[PDB]
PDB file of C-alpha atoms in Angstrom:
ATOM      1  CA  UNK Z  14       0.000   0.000   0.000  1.00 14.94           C
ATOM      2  CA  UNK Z  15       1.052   3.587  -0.944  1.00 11.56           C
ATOM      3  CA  UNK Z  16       3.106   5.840   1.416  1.00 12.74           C
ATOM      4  CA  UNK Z  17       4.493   9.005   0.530  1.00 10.12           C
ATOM      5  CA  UNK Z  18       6.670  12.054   1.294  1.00 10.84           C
ATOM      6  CA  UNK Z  19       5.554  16.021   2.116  1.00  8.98           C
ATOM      7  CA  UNK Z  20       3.958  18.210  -0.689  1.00  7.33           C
ATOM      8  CA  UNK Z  21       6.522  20.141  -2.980  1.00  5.35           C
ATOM      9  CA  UNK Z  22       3.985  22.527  -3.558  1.00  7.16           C
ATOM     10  CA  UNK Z  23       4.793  26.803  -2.997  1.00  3.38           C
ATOM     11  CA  UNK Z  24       2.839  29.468  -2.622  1.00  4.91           C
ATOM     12  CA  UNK Z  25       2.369  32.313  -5.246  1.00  5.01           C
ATOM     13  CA  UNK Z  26       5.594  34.462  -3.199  1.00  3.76           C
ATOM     14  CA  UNK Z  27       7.750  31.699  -3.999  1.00  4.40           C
ATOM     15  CA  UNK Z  28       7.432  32.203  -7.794  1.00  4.86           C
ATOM     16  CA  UNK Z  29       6.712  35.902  -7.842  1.00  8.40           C
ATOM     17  CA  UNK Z  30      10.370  35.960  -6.477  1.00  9.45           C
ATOM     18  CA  UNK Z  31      12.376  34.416  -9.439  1.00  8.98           C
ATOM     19  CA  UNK Z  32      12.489  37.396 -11.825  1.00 11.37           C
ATOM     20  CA  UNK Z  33      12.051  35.631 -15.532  1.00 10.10           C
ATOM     21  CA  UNK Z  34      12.365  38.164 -18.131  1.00 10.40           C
ATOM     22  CA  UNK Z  35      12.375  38.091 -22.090  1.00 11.38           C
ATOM     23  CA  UNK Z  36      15.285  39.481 -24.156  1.00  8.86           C
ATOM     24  CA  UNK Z  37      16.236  39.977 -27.099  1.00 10.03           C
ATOM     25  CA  UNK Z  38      19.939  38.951 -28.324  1.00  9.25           C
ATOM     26  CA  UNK Z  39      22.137  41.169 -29.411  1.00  8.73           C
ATOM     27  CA  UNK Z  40      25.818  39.161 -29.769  1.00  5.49           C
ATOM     28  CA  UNK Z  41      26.264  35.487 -29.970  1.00  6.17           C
ATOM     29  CA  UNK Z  42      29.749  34.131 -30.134  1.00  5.07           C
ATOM     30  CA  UNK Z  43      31.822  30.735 -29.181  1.00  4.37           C
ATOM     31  CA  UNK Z  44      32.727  30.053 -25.539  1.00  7.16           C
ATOM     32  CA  UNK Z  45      35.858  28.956 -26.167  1.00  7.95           C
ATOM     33  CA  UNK Z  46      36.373  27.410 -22.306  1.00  5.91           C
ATOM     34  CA  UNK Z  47      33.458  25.407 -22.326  1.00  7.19           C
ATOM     35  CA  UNK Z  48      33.235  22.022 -21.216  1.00  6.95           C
ATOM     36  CA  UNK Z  49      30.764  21.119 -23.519  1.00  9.15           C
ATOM     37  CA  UNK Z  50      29.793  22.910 -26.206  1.00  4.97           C
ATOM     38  CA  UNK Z  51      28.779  26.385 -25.880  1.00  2.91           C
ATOM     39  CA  UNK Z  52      27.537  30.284 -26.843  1.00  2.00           C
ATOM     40  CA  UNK Z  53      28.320  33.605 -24.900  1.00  2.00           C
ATOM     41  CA  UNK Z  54      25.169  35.816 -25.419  1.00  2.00           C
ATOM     42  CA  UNK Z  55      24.650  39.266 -25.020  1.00  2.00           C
ATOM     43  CA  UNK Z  56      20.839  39.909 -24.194  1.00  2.00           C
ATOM     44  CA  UNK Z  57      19.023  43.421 -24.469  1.00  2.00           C
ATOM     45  CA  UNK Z  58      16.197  43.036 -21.507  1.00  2.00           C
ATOM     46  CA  UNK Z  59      15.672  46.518 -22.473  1.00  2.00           C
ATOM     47  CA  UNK Z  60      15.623  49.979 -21.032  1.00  2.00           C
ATOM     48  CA  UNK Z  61      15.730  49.338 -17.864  1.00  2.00           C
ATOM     49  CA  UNK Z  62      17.418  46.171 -17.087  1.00  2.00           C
ATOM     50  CA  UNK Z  63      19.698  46.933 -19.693  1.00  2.00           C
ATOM     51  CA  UNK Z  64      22.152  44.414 -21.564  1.00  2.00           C
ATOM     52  CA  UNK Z  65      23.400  41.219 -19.877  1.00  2.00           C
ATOM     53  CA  UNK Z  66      25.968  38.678 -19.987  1.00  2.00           C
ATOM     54  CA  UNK Z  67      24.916  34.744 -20.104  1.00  2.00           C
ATOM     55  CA  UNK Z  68      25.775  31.846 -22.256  1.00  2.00           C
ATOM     56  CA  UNK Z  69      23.903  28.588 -22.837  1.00  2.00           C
ATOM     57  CA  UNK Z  70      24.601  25.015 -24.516  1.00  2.00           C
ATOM     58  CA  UNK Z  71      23.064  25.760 -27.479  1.00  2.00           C
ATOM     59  CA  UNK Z  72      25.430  24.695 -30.418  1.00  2.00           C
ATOM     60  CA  UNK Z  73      23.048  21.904 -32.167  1.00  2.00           C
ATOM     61  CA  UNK Z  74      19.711  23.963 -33.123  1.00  2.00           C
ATOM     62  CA  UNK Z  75      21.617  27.090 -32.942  1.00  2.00           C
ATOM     63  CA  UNK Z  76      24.134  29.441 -34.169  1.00  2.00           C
ATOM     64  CA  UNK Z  77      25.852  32.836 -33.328  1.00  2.00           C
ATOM     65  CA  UNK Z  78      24.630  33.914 -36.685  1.00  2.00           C
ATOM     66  CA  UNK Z  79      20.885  32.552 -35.933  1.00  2.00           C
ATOM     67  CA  UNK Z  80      20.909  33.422 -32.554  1.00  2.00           C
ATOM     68  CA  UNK Z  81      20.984  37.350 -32.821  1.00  2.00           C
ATOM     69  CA  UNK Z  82      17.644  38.441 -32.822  1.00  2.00           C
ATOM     70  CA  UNK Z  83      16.029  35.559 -31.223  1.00  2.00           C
ATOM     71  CA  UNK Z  84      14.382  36.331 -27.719  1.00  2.00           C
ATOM     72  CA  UNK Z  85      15.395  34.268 -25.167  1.00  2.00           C
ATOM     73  CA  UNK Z  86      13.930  33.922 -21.401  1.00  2.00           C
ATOM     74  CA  UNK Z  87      16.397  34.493 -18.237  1.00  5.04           C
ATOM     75  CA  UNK Z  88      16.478  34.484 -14.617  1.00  6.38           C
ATOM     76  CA  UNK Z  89      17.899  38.372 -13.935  1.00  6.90           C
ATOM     77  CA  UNK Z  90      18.083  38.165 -10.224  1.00  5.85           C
ATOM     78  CA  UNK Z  91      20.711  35.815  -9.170  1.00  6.66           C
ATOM     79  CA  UNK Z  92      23.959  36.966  -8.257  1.00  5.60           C
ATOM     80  CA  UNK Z  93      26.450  36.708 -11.694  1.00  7.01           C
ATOM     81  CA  UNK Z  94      28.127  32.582 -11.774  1.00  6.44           C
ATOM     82  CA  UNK Z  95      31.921  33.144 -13.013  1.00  4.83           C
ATOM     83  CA  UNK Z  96      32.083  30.164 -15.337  1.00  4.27           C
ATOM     84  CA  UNK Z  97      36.025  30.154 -16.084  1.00  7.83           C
ATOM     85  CA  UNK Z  98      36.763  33.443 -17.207  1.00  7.19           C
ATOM     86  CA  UNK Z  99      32.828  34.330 -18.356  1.00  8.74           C
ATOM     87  CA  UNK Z 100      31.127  36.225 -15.924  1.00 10.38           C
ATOM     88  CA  UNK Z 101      27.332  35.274 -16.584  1.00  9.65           C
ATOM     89  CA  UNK Z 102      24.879  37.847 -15.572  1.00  7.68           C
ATOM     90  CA  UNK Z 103      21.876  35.797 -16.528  1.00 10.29           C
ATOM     91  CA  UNK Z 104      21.004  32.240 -16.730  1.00 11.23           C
ATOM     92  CA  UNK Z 105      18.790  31.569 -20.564  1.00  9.66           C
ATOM     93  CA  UNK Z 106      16.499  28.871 -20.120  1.00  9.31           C
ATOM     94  CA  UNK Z 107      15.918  25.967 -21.935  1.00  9.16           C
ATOM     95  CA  UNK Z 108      14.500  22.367 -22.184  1.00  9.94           C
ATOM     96  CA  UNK Z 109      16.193  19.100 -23.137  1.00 13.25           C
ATOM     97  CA  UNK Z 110      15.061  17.531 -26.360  1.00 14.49           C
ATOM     98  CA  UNK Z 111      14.205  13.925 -27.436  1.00 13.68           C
ATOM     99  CA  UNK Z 112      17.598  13.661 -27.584  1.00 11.92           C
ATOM    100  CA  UNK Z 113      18.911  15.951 -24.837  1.00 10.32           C
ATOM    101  CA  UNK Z 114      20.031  19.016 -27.234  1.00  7.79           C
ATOM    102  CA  UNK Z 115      18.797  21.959 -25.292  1.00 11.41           C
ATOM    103  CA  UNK Z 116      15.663  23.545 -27.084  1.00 11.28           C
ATOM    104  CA  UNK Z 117      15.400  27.645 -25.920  1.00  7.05           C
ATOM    105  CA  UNK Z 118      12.626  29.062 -24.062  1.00  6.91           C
ATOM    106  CA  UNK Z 119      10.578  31.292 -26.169  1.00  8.40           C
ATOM    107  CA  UNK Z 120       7.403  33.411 -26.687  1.00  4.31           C
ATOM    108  CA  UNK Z 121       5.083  32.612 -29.077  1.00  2.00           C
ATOM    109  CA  UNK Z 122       5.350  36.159 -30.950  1.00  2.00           C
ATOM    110  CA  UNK Z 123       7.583  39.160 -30.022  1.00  2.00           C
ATOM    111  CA  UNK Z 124       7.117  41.081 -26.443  1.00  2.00           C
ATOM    112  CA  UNK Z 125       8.727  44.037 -25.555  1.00  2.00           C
ATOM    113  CA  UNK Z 126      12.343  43.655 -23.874  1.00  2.00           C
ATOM    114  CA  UNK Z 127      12.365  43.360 -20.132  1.00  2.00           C
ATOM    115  CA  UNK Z 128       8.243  41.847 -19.784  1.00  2.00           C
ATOM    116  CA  UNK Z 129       8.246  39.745 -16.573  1.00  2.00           C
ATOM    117  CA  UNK Z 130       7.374  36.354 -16.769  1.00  2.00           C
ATOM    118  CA  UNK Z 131       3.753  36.277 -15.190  1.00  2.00           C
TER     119      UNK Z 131
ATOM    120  CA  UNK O  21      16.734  41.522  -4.362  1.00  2.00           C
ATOM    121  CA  UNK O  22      18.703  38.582  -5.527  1.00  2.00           C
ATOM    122  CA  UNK O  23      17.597  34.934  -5.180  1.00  2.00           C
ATOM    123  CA  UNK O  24      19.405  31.540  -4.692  1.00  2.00           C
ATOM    124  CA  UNK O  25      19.313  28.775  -7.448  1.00  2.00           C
ATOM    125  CA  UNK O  26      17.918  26.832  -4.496  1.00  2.00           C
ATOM    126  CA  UNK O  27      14.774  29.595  -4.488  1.00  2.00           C
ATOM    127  CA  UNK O  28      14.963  29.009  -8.068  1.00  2.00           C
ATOM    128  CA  UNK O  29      14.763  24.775  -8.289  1.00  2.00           C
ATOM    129  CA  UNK O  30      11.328  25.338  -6.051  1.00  2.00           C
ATOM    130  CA  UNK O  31       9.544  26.183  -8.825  1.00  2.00           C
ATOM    131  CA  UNK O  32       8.382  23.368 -11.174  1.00  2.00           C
ATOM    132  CA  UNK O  33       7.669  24.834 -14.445  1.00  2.00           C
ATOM    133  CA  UNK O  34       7.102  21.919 -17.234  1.00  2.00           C
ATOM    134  CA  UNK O  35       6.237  22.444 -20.670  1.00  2.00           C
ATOM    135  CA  UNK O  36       2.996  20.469 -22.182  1.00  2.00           C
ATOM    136  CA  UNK O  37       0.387  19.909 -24.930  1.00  2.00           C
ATOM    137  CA  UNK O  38      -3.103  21.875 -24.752  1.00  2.00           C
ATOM    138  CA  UNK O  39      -5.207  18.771 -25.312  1.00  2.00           C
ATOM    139  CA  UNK O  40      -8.839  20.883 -24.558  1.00  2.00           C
ATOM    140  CA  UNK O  41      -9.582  24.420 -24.995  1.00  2.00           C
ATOM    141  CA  UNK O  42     -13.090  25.834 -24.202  1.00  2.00           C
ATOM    142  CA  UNK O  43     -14.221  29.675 -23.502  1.00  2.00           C
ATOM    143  CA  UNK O  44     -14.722  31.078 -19.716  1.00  2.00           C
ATOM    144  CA  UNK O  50     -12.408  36.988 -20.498  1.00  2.00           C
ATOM    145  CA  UNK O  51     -10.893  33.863 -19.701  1.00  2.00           C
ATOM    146  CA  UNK O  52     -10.504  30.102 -21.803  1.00  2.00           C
ATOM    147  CA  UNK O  53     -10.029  27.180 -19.906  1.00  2.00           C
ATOM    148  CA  UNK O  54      -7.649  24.379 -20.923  1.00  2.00           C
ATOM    149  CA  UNK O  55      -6.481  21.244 -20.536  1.00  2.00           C
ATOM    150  CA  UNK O  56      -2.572  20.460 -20.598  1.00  2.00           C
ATOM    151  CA  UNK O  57      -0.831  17.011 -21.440  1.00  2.00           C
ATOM    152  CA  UNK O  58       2.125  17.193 -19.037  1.00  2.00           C
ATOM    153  CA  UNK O  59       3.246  13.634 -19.926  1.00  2.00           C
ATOM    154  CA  UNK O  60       3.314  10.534 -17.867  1.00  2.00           C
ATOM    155  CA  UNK O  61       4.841  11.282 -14.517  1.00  2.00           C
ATOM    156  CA  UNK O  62       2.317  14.675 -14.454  1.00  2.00           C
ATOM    157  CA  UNK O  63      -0.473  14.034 -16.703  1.00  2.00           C
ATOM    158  CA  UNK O  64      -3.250  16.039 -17.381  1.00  2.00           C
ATOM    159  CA  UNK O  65      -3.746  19.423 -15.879  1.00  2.00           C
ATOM    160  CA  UNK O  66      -6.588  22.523 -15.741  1.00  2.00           C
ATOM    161  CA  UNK O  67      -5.966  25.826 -16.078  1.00  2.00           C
ATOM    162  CA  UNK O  68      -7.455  29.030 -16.912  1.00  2.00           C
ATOM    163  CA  UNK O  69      -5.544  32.165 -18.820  1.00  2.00           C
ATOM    164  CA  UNK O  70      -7.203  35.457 -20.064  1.00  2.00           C
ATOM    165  CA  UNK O  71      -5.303  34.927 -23.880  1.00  2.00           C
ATOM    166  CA  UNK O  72      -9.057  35.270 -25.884  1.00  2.00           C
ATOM    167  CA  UNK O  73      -7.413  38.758 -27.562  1.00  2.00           C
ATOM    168  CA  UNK O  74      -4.112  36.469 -29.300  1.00  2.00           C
ATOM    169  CA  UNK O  75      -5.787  32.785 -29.338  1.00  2.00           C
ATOM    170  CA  UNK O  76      -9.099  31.342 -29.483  1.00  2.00           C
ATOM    171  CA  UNK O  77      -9.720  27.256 -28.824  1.00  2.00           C
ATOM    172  CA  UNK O  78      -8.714  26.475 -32.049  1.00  2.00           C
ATOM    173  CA  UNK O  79      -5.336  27.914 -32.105  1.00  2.00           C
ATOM    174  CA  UNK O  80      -4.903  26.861 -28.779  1.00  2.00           C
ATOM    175  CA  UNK O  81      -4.947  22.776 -29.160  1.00  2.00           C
ATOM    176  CA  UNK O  82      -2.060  21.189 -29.905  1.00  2.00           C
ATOM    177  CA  UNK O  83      -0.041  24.091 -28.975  1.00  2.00           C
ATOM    178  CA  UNK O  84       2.891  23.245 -26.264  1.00  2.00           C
ATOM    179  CA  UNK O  85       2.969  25.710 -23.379  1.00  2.00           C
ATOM    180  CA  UNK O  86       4.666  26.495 -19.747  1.00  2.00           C
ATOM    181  CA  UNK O  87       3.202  26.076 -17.000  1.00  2.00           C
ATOM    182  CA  UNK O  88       4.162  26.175 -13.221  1.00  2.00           C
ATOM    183  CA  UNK O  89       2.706  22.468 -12.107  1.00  2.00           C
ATOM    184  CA  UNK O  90       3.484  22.597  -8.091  1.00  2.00           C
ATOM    185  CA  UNK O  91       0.900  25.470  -7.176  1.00  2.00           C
ATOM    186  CA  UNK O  92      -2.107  24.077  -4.986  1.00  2.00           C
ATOM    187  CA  UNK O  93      -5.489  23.265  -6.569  1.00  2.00           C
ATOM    188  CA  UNK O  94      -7.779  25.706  -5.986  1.00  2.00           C
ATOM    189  CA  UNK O  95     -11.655  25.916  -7.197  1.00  2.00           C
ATOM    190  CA  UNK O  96     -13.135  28.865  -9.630  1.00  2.00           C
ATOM    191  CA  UNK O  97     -16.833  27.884  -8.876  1.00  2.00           C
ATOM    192  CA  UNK O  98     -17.086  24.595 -10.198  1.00  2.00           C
ATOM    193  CA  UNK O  99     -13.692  24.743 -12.220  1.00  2.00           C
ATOM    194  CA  UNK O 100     -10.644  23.270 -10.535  1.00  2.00           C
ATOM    195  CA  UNK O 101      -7.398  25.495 -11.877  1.00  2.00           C
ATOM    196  CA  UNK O 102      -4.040  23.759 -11.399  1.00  2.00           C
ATOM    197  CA  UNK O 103      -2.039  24.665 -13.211  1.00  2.00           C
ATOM    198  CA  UNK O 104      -0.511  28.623 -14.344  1.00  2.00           C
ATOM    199  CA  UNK O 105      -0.380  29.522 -17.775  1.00  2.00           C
ATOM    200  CA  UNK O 106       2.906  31.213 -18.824  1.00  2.00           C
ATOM    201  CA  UNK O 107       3.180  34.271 -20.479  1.00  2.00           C
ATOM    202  CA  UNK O 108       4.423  37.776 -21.020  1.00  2.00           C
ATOM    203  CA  UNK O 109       2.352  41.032 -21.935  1.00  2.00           C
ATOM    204  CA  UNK O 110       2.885  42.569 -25.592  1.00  2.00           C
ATOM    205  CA  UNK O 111       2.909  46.250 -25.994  1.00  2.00           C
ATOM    206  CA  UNK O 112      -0.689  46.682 -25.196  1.00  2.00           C
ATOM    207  CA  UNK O 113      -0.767  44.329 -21.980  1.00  2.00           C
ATOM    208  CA  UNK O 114      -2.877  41.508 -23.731  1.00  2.00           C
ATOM    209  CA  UNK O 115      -1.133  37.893 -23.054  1.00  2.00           C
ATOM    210  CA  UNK O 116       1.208  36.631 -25.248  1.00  2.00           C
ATOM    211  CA  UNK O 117       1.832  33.079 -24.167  1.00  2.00           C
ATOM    212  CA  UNK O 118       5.581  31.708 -22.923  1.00  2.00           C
ATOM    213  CA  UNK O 119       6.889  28.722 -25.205  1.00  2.00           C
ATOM    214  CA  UNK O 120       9.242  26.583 -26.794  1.00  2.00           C
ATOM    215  CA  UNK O 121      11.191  27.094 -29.778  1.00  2.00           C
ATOM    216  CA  UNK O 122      11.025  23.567 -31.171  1.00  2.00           C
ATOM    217  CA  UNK O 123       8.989  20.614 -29.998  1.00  2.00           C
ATOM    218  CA  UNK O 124      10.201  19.131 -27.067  1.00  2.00           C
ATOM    219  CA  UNK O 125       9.065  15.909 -24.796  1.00  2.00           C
ATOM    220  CA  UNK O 126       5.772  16.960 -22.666  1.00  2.00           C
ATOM    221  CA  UNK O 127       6.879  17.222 -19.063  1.00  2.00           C
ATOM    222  CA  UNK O 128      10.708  18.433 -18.919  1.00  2.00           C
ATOM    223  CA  UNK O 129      11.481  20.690 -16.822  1.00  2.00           C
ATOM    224  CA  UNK O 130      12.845  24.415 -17.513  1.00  2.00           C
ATOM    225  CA  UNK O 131      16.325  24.712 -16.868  1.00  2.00           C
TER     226      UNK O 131
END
């Protein structure tokens, strides 16, 4: 017969908290350092927020060439992750595929720069 | 200001398959999370973007480890993802390819 462990539920706070914003890329090169594969992004979250650092492991559907232009989602409030010698600002989020190639996060049309995840 | 990847791994947002679509200004939906979630209510006001039609089949986001909680007779469980355009009408949060229903955002 079934037993099981506490709820992992949260309340609304607990979400409200992570700050998920979309972005618009605005450079996309090679990250040289990288364990496994990856790009160093430059993301415009707009006005206010301005232009942040992140990078993501994003070689197989994507390209530096591709990539500028796309918007991307990011957590912008946790403190910046030095990564060797990359200083990431944001982390870009993503899903694993079929295969586990890491599909972005997107909207489903454009949104201004900086809109909060809601 | 600043949060902890810890604060951030609390959250369990899952992307899914919009299996039922109906109007509520509101639509109410049903969400294929996959086999370890399964199927899943919720309720977003996207009629100015979407109608039922566009809506099914579509993969969204959606934050799976809220509690239930009753609108009338109309369980919700699950939130909706999006972002407001320019005009503050719902676009909806996705993926850029198709990807398996029930991974998690990372």
């Amino acid at each position: 017969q079934p037993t099981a462990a506490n709820s992992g539920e949260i309340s609304y706070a607990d979400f409200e908290k992570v700050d998920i914003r979309v972005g618009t890329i605005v450079e996309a090169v090679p990250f040289p350092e990288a364990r496994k594969p990856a790009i160093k992004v430059k993301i415009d979250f707009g006005p206010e927020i301005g232009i942040k650092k992140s990078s993501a492991q994003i070689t197989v559907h994507y390209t530096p060439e591709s990539l500028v232009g796309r918007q991307v989602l990011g957590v912008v409030n946790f403190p910046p992750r030095q990564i060797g010698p990359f200083r990431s600002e944001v982390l870009t989020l993503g899903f694993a595929d079929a295969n586990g190639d890491i599909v972005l996060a997107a909207v489903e049309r454009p949104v201004p720069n900086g809109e909060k995840m809601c």
